[PDB]
């Protein structure tokens, strides 16, 4: 079989592969991405709410400088589903989940890890720029652990996937 | 010299920087020991928003000054 633009082979083994899979176009795709990865069955406001009950709950870590804007303020507009969530709630999500996540940067060819060194298992969202998707393997499997062999060939296949993606137009960015 | 950085994700890093090293510097220096783009980064130091274009001697940040990383990445 021949893979599709938004597949890629993982190892030299050729039985596995990586593959996007694309979440709703709405506000809140960043928690549907993490969703998908940790629960697989959708949800936004159980995400979204404890992203602002932490936020609230520890004005000391998220003081008005990190947040870049006033820790009531910020707490009240995560809870919209107009609000774009991004690395604040990343780490938080990932804290609370003890899970760590990989963000498959596209336009830069990077992968940002959030709390590799506090979890070995993570999962991998795509980061488009100006949008979120869940990466998994063979369609079944969504998150790995760091210690495996097999992670570093997940690793790999994420970054040509992330690459092909960049040569193909599908990158955006916006800074 | 050597400054420190710490991330909302607990991770303490250190660079070794001088008073004339801009911010973008330091945000270069991150993106080389982290490999984070300086353009999804947000550097504060003492309750400050630093700026790309000033200096680490403009925000008096020396020896063993611990700086904060927030990442962007919003979609």
Redesign the interface.
Known sequence: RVLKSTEMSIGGSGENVLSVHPVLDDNSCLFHAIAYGIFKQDSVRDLREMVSKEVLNNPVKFNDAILDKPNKDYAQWILKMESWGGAIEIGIISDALAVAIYVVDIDAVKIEKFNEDKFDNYILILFNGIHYDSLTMNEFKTVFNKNQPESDDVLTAALQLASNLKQTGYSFNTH | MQIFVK?????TITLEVEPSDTIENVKAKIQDKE???P??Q?L?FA???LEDGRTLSDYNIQKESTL?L??????
């Open positions: 991330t909302l994700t607990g991770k490999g984070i783009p353009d999804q947000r504060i309750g400050k928003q904060h927030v990442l962007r990445l919003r979609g």
